[PDB]
Amino acid sequence: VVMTQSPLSLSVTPGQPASISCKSSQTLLHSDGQTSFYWYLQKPGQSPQLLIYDISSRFSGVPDRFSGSGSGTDFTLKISRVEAEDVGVYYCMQGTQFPWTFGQGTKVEIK
């Protein structure tokens, strides 16, 4: 309902797959009128980048390794293989009718 963002964990074993999830309240129509869900990656360093929107369209730099999905009010991000560099905080956010509210993000570590 409020984008808490699932707990800050995933398997940290290198080379293994992972799934990151979030929760909201409704079909999320965007101020431009389209349904939207946004996935951003906050690197451990200087800045965020946009990965996926509306669990379907993927942005340059992450079309082969990352994939969006979900149903109802429960949405996810799939990482095909968590390939060593895939660290940082992955956020699901309401880039919709809602006033750009972000959850806590999922902390990703690889060990």
């Binding site: 129509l29 009128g33 389209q34 509306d54 379907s56």
Partner: protein
């Protein structure tokens, strides 16, 4: 188990190019042939067997006595990493195999040592079981190895000609680059084939017995040009020439940025169609492959410029118009469209357009509840102009609340519907076609300026070839280039240096060969039309010349005239009568200097003069009689063409299309018949001027004058006289053929013409001058001649006093014309000319049939037998249009030639009337001297006249006086002149010296001794004195 000189080819290597029987003909063709006198490498096994390059075709030959050469291996890598073919005669049969063979480094045939194993075989064939020159041709084309063979007994590279025959067309599928021989455990030769043109000569049994290598030298080229193995004499134009460009001058503007296409095609937000937006692209490199070689687009359609051509072009500006429409609107974004979007929201010009690009946005712009952010207009008081926007939103009133509407509608874009209702992003790229210095160019590299020489060039999208030179033109700062009267660039501003360069064409012109006949010598000189020979010579040595011949050179015999330059003719500082004209006052000829072709200044005539005096006269004291021969055409061949047979012979489909050209076919048949008809009118008007037939007398010697060679001989099988028989002996189409051409017979046959001619000579020989005027008179020949002398102004008595000499000169003159006519080749050149032109016109008409005029075939049955009617009609109509022009051209040219023939016939008819049927008094019409008589003779296609001419001979000088003084009176001569002879004054005739006593009865009185300037005192004889 594997173990791991140069000769002149002469005229060898001709092979039959096809499987078609031909005979009695010269066939021209282009194929890979061994060039004549090419270089062929000698190898010996006495063991030179390296890998030898194939170069797309090999001439291989060997001389044998012990079966040393067994075969060949053709391939590339000569190992098992690539396909290769082994062709071996194993003394049993011929074995051909194509495989990735494990070939030997040191092979032989004894044990067979060619290969150890074989893999991935594509072809295998075993043939039937089986001092010497064996010749082979190995040609490679489309996966096939074409092999020709032949044989000649030898004793040794032998010189000669040996036509080779085909043996194999092997479907091997191998890309062959080199080869080796297979030798037995001899000598051989290898040459290379080239795509030269040959003229092949077939004998009466269809064997090729000779040939011309069309590129060997300028004479060989001439032999192809006129389709002959022999040339007679003169200037023959055979081709043209040009200088081939050396470097490439490419100059693009200093544009280093990259065009922002993402900003046009990948933007998050697009405008609605009623309110579309435009953005400008400038000062950048446009790689257009980014929009083209990866598909996102459902629509990628360009007008004017194909999409693939965009990277080669520069534009002044590029503009991108963008908007969102539905799928059923995308089709309206085009030139020539109507509809709500095309008419009220976005109008394109009905002019060249750049590119209209579009893609589906169902998952971007459409929504599950309906996206209503996109709008379009449906109500407007009028349509938009190209690229006009009208975003006004005011109430619309159809009549200028009931019937008050808002002009905008919307697009309810949903994700639940089909394609015609899905949203599309449409981008239109407008390219401005270089109206200002380019700002947008493709990813090209530039080069430097190569000046004052023939180069290829490319400036900022402007291309061509030529010579770039700096110039004085002063362009305005906004002008990039200029043009001459024709639509061609005259000069261009350089995009990096801003200098102005004029563009001259590269040198070119016609090529003609000066030649004596080939019966004298195969020596020629070449004339290059309208060029500076500095460049011609340079292009020959620095070979950049086309055409150029393989065995040809430029010597020191090079000079230039206004007619172009000659190479090979020796300039001389003398002069002579013109033999073969070059032009601009200079002629070529073949003379001894050991002979050579020389170029000399024309002589105008003999340099001689006559002294001027105020008191003298020259008077001929003797004379001679000679006979002049004059030749002129009267008629030409009466050709006829069957229009339908020529164009649509035996074709229903063609004939039905031919009918759509209406009256054309009938008019051709009619016009040509009309021409043929006038050929009989001309013949009749020239010869049938005889009122009645006159008979040939039994006596042919009248007064000493022998007419037996002019008149028909009653003891011969013919009715022609000796001279006429000689004229006739001295000088495709049906007479049916498939081409519809034929030649019709004349109305008046050869016997009728000879009969008229004989009646006319026989008659004027005894009829006097009234032969064709009224009743014939019976006049002794000698008197008739006396009157013809009297008619010149020579006193009548001269004929009788000198009758023996006059008759003897006449006879001799007849023998002289027979000798001249009998042994020469040029006397009847005018009649040969009308014959040759007929043949050339018909040969041209027939050759045109083989042109396909763009059709798949020249033969209607090669279209119809393998093509559906719909396409066949396309191919047939193309072929018909061409043939209609061929026939129309033929008739038109035949028609103007007919007019020239009529003019000649009219002259002949006039001449018959004034020279034969009477005595002409006009100057230089019936001969060069004074006219006496003439005799027509029958000739093929024309008339030959013999004119009997009186010519004054040796003259004597006399002192003269215009008048004489006698007893105070001024006496003048009545007919003659006064002359001073051995110490006495006499009166004479101007054309013949026969002095008479000056008397009162051969003079008259006018005025007196004090009023005439330049007179003398004299005595005038008065007969009265002795009577007194």
């Amino acid at each position: 188990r594997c173990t791991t000189t140069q000769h002149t080819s002469s005229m060898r290597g001709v092979y039959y190019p096809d499987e078609i029987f031909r005979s009695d003909t010269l066939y021209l063709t282009q194929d890979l042939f061994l060039p004549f006198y090419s270089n062929v490498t000698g190898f010996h096994t006495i063991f030179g067997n390296p890998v030898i390059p194939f170069k797309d075709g090999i001439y291989f030959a060997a001389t044998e006595k012990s079966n040393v050469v067994r075969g060949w291996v053709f391939g590339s890598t000569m190992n098992n990493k690539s396909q290769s073919v082994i062709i071996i005669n194993n003394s049993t049969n011929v074995v051909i195999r194509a495989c990735n063979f494990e070939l030997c480094d040191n092979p032989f045939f004894a044990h067979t040592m060619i290969f150890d194993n074989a893999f991935n075989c594509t072809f295998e064939y075993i043939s039937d079981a089986f001092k010497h020159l064996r010749e082979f041709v190995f040609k490679n084309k489309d996966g096939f190895l074409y092999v020709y063979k032949g044989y000649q007994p030898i004793d040794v590279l032998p010189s000669g000609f040996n036509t080779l025959k085909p043996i194999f067309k092997l479907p091997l599928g191998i890309n062959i680059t080199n080869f080796r021989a297979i030798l037995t455990a001899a000598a051989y030769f290898v040459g290379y084939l080239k795509p030269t043109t040959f003229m092949l000569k077939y004998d009466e049994n269809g064997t090729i017995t000779d040939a011309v290598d069309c590129s060997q030298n300028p004479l060989a080229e001439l032999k192809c040009s006129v389709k002959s193995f022999e040339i007679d004499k003169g200037i023959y134009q055979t081709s043209n020439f040009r200088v081939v460009p050396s470097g490439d001058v490419v100059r693009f503007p200093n544009i280093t940025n990259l065009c922002p296409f993402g900003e046009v095609f990948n933007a998050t937000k697009f405008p609605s169609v009623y309110a579309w937006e435009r953005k400008k692209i400038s000062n950048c490199v446009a790689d257009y492959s980014v929009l083209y070689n990866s598909t996102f687009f459902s629509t990628f359609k360009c007008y004017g410029v194909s999409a693939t051509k965009l990277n080669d072009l520069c534009f002044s500006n590029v503009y991108a118009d963008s908007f969102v429409v539905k799928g059923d609107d995308v089709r309206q974004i085009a030139p020539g469209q109507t509809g709500v979007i095309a008419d009220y929201n976005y109008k394109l010009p009905d002019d060249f357009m750049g590119c209209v690009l579009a893609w589906n946005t169902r998952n971007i712009d459409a929504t599950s509840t309906g996206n209503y952010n996109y709008k379009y207009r449906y109500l407007r008081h009028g349509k938009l102009r190209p690229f006009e926007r009208d975003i006004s939103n005011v109430p619309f009133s159809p009549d200028g609340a009931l019937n008050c509407y808002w002009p905008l509608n919307d697009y309810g874009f949903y994700t639940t519907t089909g394609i015609g209702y899905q949203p599309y992003r449409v981008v239109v790229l407008s390219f401005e076609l270089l109206n200002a210095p380019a700002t947008v160019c493709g990813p090209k590299l530039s080069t430097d300026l190569i000046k004052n020489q023939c180069v290829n060039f490319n400036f900022n999208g402007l291309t061509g070839t030529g010579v770039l030179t700096p110039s004085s033109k002063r362009f305005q700062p906004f002008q990039q280039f200029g043009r001459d009267v024709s639509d061609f660039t005259d000069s261009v501003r350089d995009p990096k240096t801003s200098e102005i360069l004029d563009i001259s064409p590269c040198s070119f012109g016609g090529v003609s060969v000066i030649t004596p006949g080939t019966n004298a010598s195969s020596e020629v000189a070449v004339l290059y039309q309208d060029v500076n020979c500095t460049d011609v010579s340079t292009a020959i040595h620095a070979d950049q010349l086309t055409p150029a011949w393989r065995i040809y050179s430029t010597g020191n015999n090079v000079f230039q005239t206004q007619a172009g330059c000659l190479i090979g003719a020796e300039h001389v500082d003398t002069s002579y009568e013109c033999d073969i004209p070059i032009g601009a006052g200079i002629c070529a000829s073949y003379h001894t200097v050991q002979k050579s072709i020389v170029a000399y200044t024309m002589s105008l005539g003999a340099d001689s003069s006559i002294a001027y005096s105020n008191n003298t006269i020259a008077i001929p004291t003797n004379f001679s009689i000679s006979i002049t021969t004059e030749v002129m055409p009267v008629s030409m061949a009466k050709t006829s063409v069957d229009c339908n047979m020529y164009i649509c012979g035996d074709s229903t489909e063609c004939a039905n299309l031919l009918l759509q050209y209406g009256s054309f076919c009938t008019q051709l048949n009619r016009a040509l018949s009309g021409i043929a008809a006038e050929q009989d009118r001309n013949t009749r008007e020239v010869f049938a001027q005889v009122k009645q037939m006159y008979k040939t007398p039994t006596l042919k010697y009248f007064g000493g004058f022998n007419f037996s060679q002019i008149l028909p001989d009653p003891l011969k099988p013919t009715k022609r006289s000796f001279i006429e028989d000689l004229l006739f002996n001295k000088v495709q189409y049906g007479e049916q053929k498939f081409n519809g051409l034929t030649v019709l017979p004349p109305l008046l046959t050869d016997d009728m013409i000879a009969a008229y001619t004989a009646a006319l000579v026989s008659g004027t020989a005894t009829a006097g001058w009234t032969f064709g005027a009224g009743a014939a008179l019976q006049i002794p020949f000698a008197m008739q001649m006396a009157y013809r002398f009297n008619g010149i102004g020579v006193t009548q008595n001269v004929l009788y006093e000198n009758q023996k000499q006059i008759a003897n000169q006449f006879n001799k003159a007849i023998s002289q014309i027979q000798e001249s006519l009998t042994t020469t080749s040029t006397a009847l050149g005018k009649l040969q000319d009308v014959v040759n032109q007929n043949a050339q016109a018909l040969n041209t008409l027939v050759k045109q049939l083989s042109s396909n005029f763009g059709a798949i075939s020249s033969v209607l049955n090669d279209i119809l037998s393998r093509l559906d009617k719909v396409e066949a009609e396309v191919q047939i109509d193309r072929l018909i249009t061409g043939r209609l022009q061929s026939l129309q051209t033929y008739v038109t040219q035949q028609l103007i030639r007919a007019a020239e023939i009529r003019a000649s016939a009219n002259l002949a008819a006039t001449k018959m009337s004034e020279c034969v049927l009477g005595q002409s008094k006009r100057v230089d019409f019936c001969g060069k001297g004074y006219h006496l008589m003439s005799f027509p003779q029958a000739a093929p296609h024309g008339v030959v006249f013999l004119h009997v001419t009186y010519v004054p001979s040796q003259e004597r000088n006399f002192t003269t006086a215009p008048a004489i003084c006698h007893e105070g009176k001024a006496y003048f001569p009545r007919e003659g002149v006064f002359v001073f002879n051995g110490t006495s004054w006499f009166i004479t005739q101007r054309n013949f010296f026969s002095p008479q006593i000056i008397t009162t009865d051969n003079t008259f009185v006018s005025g007196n001794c004090d009023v005439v300037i330049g007179i003398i005192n004299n005595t005038v004889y008065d007969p009265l004195q002795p009577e007194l």
